[PDB]
Amino acid sequence: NFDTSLPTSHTYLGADMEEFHGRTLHDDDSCQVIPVLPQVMMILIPGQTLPLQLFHPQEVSMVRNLIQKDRTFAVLAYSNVQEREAQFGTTAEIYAYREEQDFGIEIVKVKAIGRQRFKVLELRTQSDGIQQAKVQILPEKPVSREDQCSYKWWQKYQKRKFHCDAETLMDRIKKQLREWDENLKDDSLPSNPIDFSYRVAACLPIDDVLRIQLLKIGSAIQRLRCELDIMNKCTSLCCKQCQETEITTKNEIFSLSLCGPMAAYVNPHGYVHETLTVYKACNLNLIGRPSTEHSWFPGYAWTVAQCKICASHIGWKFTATKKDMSPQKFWGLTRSALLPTI
């Protein structure tokens, strides 16, 4: 019953956001210098939305200057946090902006979207704490889904085309994605192989090492093959701080926004979570009472949920408030705090 387009708007940030219609792509195999934000611990994939709320003086100044000049920055895919070294990254583009003054406080709300992948040669820190990286840009059916019509039709397609694959791999991935979401409609998933592969890669609930390994792949067919394998081997998700506890199973997850099962949301303190929605959670304990301010799913009330045999923070409750809403109960879980198991 719940509208599945609403979460993607990130309405909780603010209804009034200065918006920019534009796009800029760097010539492939070129060399350019890009600034990167002080701390962004997420492997941003092209076509994935990213909200931020920044506080620091240098951050607000540099992002303001960015939106004045070129409207893009860089996000480095760190292999590990402590070393601070990385060799690939993604350019992100600002497409929504707002600056907020609250009784002397200053913050900046922003929404960006990934565009291009790149390799970093070396990075140099200028005096004011901004990091500038030298970087080379990396180059890139029946109307009804009725079973029998698709069966004979696909046999015929295979016979005709290879009488002497992109569509086939996309079709199988779409079959799995539909297994996740019955309401899923084809026109929502892009028909271009590249966009489809990026969307699937973003939807996959997988750890960062696989994320970067998948981001480095330069061919759409290779991405689709790797995604097919990963989707068809993932078993369940386990608390990162237990190494063995069943919080969710593959079949429990259910998409609730156009972005897919998993998306990116932001905290009132500027920290970013990747949230995955599921209608069944285990080994979780609730603390406190329902609240609704700054809620990520409008009409729902969240309650922190902690790994009950681990005392570590995992997710939330999100019980609906009105009693005409179909999912009267579901759950959100933080990808950063659980790992795949096999």
């Binding site: 009784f103 002397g104 406080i105």
Partner: protein
């Protein structure tokens, strides 16, 4: 054990309360303009407010009017400095800010203004 950010965060939470106008028990009138806040915070930042709210007769006043000619922008900026420990001086108001701090008996702020 000591918390490096406990004080700053508690101040920010108090500012969040002020912005949402929650449990604010007093209002200050400067230059015919009103600013609502809490007595405890005001008396913790100003000698004037400390004197007023430690006075057993005046502490019951939920409305307080200062010297009418105190600049409103200066009082507002000083109140924001009270609630964020941050003071944004500028060329066009430093004199008024210094005068208002003197009226409020905020010696450190007045002394800092003397330097600029």
């Amino acid at each position: 054990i000591q918390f490096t950010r406990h004080a700053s965060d508690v101040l920010l939470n108090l500012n969040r309360l002020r912005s949402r106008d929650i449990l604010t028990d007093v209002v200050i009138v400067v230059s015919r303009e009103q600013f609502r806040a809490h007595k405890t915070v005001l008396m913790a930042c100003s000698g004037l407010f400390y004197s007023i709210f430690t006075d057993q007769l005046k502490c019951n006043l939920s409305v307080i009017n200062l010297d009418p000619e105190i600049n409103p922008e200066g009082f507002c900026i000083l109140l924001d400095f009270m609630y964020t420990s941050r003071l944004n001086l500028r060329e066009g108001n430093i004199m008024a800010v210094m005068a208002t701090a003197m009226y409020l008996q905020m010696e450190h702020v007045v002394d800092t203004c003397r330097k600029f």
